[PDB]
Symmetry: C3
Subunit: 188 residues, 3 copies
């Protein structure tokens, strides 16, 4: 599953290269292991390979990671106790398993230190990835911006990565860069 | 009056046995001294507080005391509690005939008390002495606790803790074991 | 111009006298420099207003937000540390006089690490509105207008407001520690 493992690390590095997530920000991972393995039921092997490759890069930058479980658990997420506390998350009571929750949330639950399940992130993630068309947008804060990365797939699953950036505001006379602001000042 | 305190201490004792509230959590007390004895009693308020407060405070649990409905159930908390929990302070001073004896006894005993609008449903547990209701202050899901002490004085005691919502459909599981058993398959 | 900074300085001192804001509190400034002048904006008039109002607030550890005009949806300039302390949402834009006003632009130029934020989520404890631009949307309940001796800044009318807790309770309630102790006598032996 090395390529799953390898492709995972790559995307995480590419992502952070394009979106240098600061310490304390929050990252959300959603994905389907059945999709990662294609048409050949979930896979724990694949699950651990994805995490194996994806998590270190983010953890090294002190970025908090959340792993969304599937719809049978309402998409509650596996997070470290400290992340729930740092982000004011509401804990919900359930324990994931491949058949009820999925292999990726289950493997995350086993690999974390003091995992807890949370109802949602209250849409506070700053960036994240969707592996396999499971959807992760509900977890991201405005404004989500899809990121085209060179790594287009993790196994056979289509990879969708998104960063977030602030809303663009103000009317026809407004500007959006410091450079343009300075020109309006010279003109003034 | 010492018996009211003794029932209060046994209640607090049983309550924390079943729900060992951690440092930093919030307990809400609501109650009517009139029901413990329609005239409030500061004496009865002192006994209930002496019985309830020490075991909570020694655990680092924050305490809120709900005033009656004439002050719209605004509660008494230490200024630090209002700060840790992002509570909104309102302007009023309680007295037994408008606030009730217990909010009054708390306001006088607290180091730096403020009246707050509500706790924004943040409490992890509490007690209702006399059926005055405290549910609106508790975070989901409130689980009432059976304690041997069913009354304080002549007032019924309702005690409750809180716990996370149970979620997931028919295949979901709820204990680490059940999970393992599921992995082994 | 010095006349404008002096009226700003008097406004400030008097305001903080009537409402001694604590460190960590939040003050909101809104205004039209064109109104101060008595048309187009002026960075000089902005400069005079900020030099008069900001040193006394900052020395008390009060966080300051400066409201841009409606072309920028009244987003506000605040230090990044303030956006963070008050859980504010950063918005993407750069004010300039013609779009945002001179006051907000001067704040942005002067702050150390400025960011624009969408609103203050009505968390401000007090502020000033110079010229009738409105700042009430930024104040937490209950806003209380203060009458300062300083009524204008330049030609702009000055409106200053503090905030205080909602007064609650029915007919039997009391509102001072004094009234409370008296009510307790009457109950106690
Ligand atoms: Zn100057
Ligand atoms: Zn200066």
């Amino acid at each position: 599953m090395e390529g799953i493992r390898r492709a995972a690390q790559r995307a995480a590095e590419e992502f952070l290269q394009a979106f240098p997530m600061a310490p304390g920000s929050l990252f959300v991972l959603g994905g389907s292991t059945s999709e990662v393995l294609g048409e050949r039921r979930p896979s724990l092997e694949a699950a651990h390979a994805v995490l194996e490759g994806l998590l270190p890069p983010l953890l090294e930058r002190g970025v908090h990671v959340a792993v969304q479980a599937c719809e049978h658990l309402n998409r509650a997420l596996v997070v470290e106790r400290e992340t729930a506390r740092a982000f004011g998350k509401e804990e919900v009571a359930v324990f994931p398993h491949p058949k009820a929750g999925g292999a990726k949330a289950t493997a995350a639950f086993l690999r974390f230190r003091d995992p807890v399940m949370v109802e949602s992130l209250k849409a506070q993630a700053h960036g994240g990835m969707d592996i396999g068309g499971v959807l992760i947008g509900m977890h991201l804060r405005p404004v989500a911006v899809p990121l085209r990365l060179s790594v287009r797939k993790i196994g056979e699953a289509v990879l969708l990565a998104a960063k977030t950036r602030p809303k663009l505001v103000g009317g026809a006379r407004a500007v959006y860069t410091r450079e343009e602001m300075l020109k309006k000042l010279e003109e003034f």
